[PDB]
Amino acid sequence: GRIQDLEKYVEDTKIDLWSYNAELLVALENQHTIDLTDSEMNKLFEKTKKQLRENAEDMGNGCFKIYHKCDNACIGSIRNGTYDHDVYRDEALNNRFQI
Amino acid sequence: QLRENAEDMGNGCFKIYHKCDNACIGSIRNGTYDHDVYRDEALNNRFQI
Numbered sequence: 691g692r693i694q695d696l697e698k699y700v701e702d703t704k705i706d707l708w709s710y711n712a713e714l715l716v717a718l719e720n721q722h723t724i725d726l727t728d729s730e731m732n733k734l735f736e737k738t739k740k741q742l743r744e745n746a747e748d749m750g751n752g753c754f755k756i757y758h759k760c761d762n763a764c765i766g767s768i769r770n771g772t773y774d775h776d777v778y779r780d781e782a783l784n785n786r787f788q789i
Numbered sequence: 790q791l792r793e794n795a796e797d798m799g800n801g802c803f804k805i806y807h808k809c810d811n812a813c814i815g816s817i818r819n820g821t822y823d824h825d826v827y828r829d830e831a832l833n834n835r836f837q838i
Contacts, residue, residue, distance in 0.1 A: 740797055740799050741799055743796060743797070743799070744796070783836060787836070
């Protein structure tokens with residue numbers, strides 16, 4: 691009777707609370723991961739563009755236009771985060787703002 | 790606020806293209822800085838030939 695009735699209550703209480711509680715935990719982390727992943731994408735994205743003082747336009751689909759013959763070393767340089775803007779800057783601008 | 794008067798140095802830094810006096814530095818701080826007054830000289834400096 692009565693006693694048994696209350697621990698059935700206690701049981702269902704716990705499972706319900708935990709179920710919802712877990713449901714939120716899961717969903718909150720999923721969002722967090724998806725955020726963190728694409729944010730790091732954005733962070734790498736920014737790193738490139740920030741490094742590229744002026745030599746990069748924005749193509750319109752996460753693409754950049756480089757205004758100098760950029761050979762394997764050069765392409766690899768931007769990847770390596772060592773790329774000097776100065777060496778090419780002048781020719782990049784004559785190309786970019788051509789008359 | 791900085792229309793044509795700031796590059797991005799690459800470490801949360803800006804390069805202003807006019808000798809910018811204490812008033813000028815303080816102006817950007819104060820959020821009153823006109824771009825126009827200096828804009829022309831900033832560009833001749835920035836896109837020098």
